[PDB]
């Protein structure tokens, strides 16, 4: 009965996992022999780094250009940084570039995507400047496709570096995460691995451990396809033999009539996928970013991704007859994302509605060692020993994500998209008062029932013992990433 | 609050069944641990058969291949019923009842509500 549905999820969810692990160490090796196989003095693509933003931290704008002008790379052939709106509010964010690069903070009079003609000029004569555009704002994708226009009439750039205002690359990034497009003639857009550098809040760590088993698990499984889904929303390098062409049906999306712009990292990668081109994601381009905070902004940021998702996993689906036989796994894992979910809403209606201790603790158990088998190995693959964190990860995915998965589907079609999430939280409470006022009793004779009241004990321990860890931790300043706990100091003195 | 209401006896030889039926009206009869007791003219009561909450069945020595023990949630009942009687088996048959309890279940000290009388005699 419960077997069929516990220990069936159990393999389900493991399975894929386990490929997926082997899957991202077979990518790793792959991508070390290319790094090995390259001379010491490499300088073969001239990139254009190209920034996007819209009131972005002041200081962490700053840390952004600085760590761009830091970056080591021989070739970089200028610096595009288009800066959404103009506002007495915007050139408080012109002049944190402008105390950075140089003075060339122009202000084309129209957005060059309303503008008809698409091309170069834009006040721009100068192809050996740095420059920051300061234009009308209509997101991210209007302001991004200005920069794409001023790094194509070039024709000394080969390629691009997408970044976003608050990130923080390494040195070696730009370096190991353009290789790969030279490396074969078929990759026309690169990944990145995107770390979080705030780790301060109980949110802002699991939801960081995710980023991680996210980025170096999913995406590095995709990689050794060459077929990765979505490219790193930070960063990301990208051909301009594919960019110069993709770049006019990008900016003109209709999903089904109105038109609106959400996710377009999402879509340049579809765009890349669904002309038959492949895609790698090397862990060798460190970069950093920030994570939301409070849970009504995560829940929105997820809710986003979810509408996103929701849309584009229909053309991931219909291009896998571009690619070729390796492409079977773009569609197997369009269908897991989806029966995952529907198996995680399934597993808990059931153990909810009928209510049986021996069918409740077995499962919670069951998850329990399952995550902590994922975590074992993110702490492996990591060597951080901070990685076990991510069996609390399970809260914040039943929680956030899943309201967030329900809101997305019904907008597909406070009140707009937080009254489903109330809604949630009201019904899995009144599952669990149901369940616990049901099953009132207490029968220690009984075997089935000292092992359900031993196992949810020893659950509630394992928990309360983690989350307690974590406190010492913070107490302790543990949790704090290395680079968090400087740019705590450099924002003391500023 | 539990009332137990118990039937099912009479003469009958031995090789018959004679099933014995305890019914039992409260609040929420599918909590309740249940078991039969077989109050002969000596001995008080010893313990026969008894099922938890969840389906776990108990019996006593030497009526393993004898007595068979279930329930019915739905109208809620126990429905004991027996094979191969013996005449060393006419007595009174108990049933008792149980929702919090610990780990002796098989003294009347335990049990909270109780039965009223289940008298069968057995033939040659």
């Known amino acids: 009965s419960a077997v069929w549905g516990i220990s069936v999820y159990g393999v389900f969810v493991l399975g894929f996992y386990i490929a997926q692990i082997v899957f991202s160490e077979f990518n790793r090796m792959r991508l070390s022999d290319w790094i090995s196989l390259r001379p010491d003095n490499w300088n073969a693509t001239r990139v254009a780094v190209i920034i996007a933003g819209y009131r972005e931290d002041p200081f962490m704008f700053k840390k952004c250009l600085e760590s761009v002008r830091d970056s080591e790379y021989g070739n970089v052939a200028r610096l595009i940084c288009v800066i959404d709106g103009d506002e007495e509010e915007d050139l408080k964010m012109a002049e944190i570039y402008k105390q950075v690069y140089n003075d060339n903070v122009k202000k084309p009079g129209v957005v060059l995507c309303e503008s008809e003609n698409k091309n170069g000029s834009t006040i721009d004569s100068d192809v050996s400047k740095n420059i920051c555009i300061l234009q009308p704002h209509r997101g991210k994708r209007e302001s991004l496709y200005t920069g794409f226009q001023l790094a194509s009439m070039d024709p000394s750039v080969h390629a691009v570096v997408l970044i976003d205002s608050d990130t923080v690359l390494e040195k070696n990034a730009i370096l190991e995460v353009v290789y790969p497009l030279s490396c074969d003639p078929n990759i026309k857009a690169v990944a990145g691995e995107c770390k979080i550098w705030n780790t301060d809040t109980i949110l802002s760590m699991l939801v960081s451990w995710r980023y991680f088993s996210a980025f170096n698990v999913e995406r590095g499984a995709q990689s050794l396809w060459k077929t990765v889904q979505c490219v790193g929303g930070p960063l990301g390098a990208y051909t301009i033999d594919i960019i110069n062409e993709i770049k006019d049906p990008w900016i003109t999306q209709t999903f089904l009539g109105n038109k609106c712009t959400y996710g377009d990292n999402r879509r340049l990668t579809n765009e890349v996928l669904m002309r038959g081109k492949k895609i790698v994601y090397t862990p060798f381009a460190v970069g950093w970013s920030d994570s939301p905070t409070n849970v009504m902004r995560y829940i929105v940021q997820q809710t986003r991704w979810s509408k996103s998702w929701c849309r584009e996993i229909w053309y991931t689906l219909g291009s896998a007859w571009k690619h070729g036989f390796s492409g079977i796994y773009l569609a197997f894992e369009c269908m897991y994302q989806i029966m995952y979910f529907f198996l995680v809403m399934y597993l808990f209606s059931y153990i909810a509605i009928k209510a049986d201790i021996r069918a409740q603790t077995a499962t919670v158990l069951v998850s329990t060692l399952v995550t902590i088998i994922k975590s074992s190995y993110l702490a492996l693959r990591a060597k951080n020993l901070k990685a076990f964190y991510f069996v609390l990860y399970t809260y914040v995915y039943f929680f956030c994500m899943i309201p967030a998965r329900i809101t997305a589907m019904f907008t597909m079609f406070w009140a707009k998209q937080f009254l489903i999430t109330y809604m949630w939280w009201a019904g899995v409470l009144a599952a669990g008062v149901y369940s616990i006022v049901d099953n009132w009793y207490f029968d220690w004779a009984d075997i089935q029932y000292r092992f359900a009241l031993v196992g949810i004990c020893s659950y509630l321990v394992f928990v309360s013992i983690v989350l307690v860890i974590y406190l010492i931790g913070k107490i302790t300043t543990w949790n704090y990433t290395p680079l968090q706990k400087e740019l705590i100091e450099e924002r003391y003195l500023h | 609050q539990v009332q137990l209401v118990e039937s099912g006896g009479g003469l009958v030889q031995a090789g018959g069944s004679l099933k014995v039926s305890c019914a039992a009206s409260?609040?929420?009869?599918?909590?309740?641990?249940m078991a039969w007791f077989r109050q002969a003219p000596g001995k008080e009561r010893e313990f026969v058969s008894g099922?938890?909450?969840?389906?776990?069945?108990y019996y006593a020595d030497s009526v393993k291949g004898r007595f068979t023990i279930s329930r019915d949630n739905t109208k809620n009942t126990v429905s004991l019923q027996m094979d191969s009687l013996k005449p060393e088996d006419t007595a009174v048959y108990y049933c008792?009842?149980?929702?919090?309890?610990?780990?002796?279940?098989?003294?009347?000290?335990?049990?909270?509500?109780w039965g009223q009388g289940t008298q069968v005699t057995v033939s040659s």
């Open positions: 008792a009842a149980r929702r919090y309890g610990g780990t002796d279940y098989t003294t009347t000290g335990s049990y909270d509500y």
């Open positions: 099922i938890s909450a969840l389906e776990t069945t």
């Open positions: 409260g609040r929420a009869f599918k909590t309740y641990r």
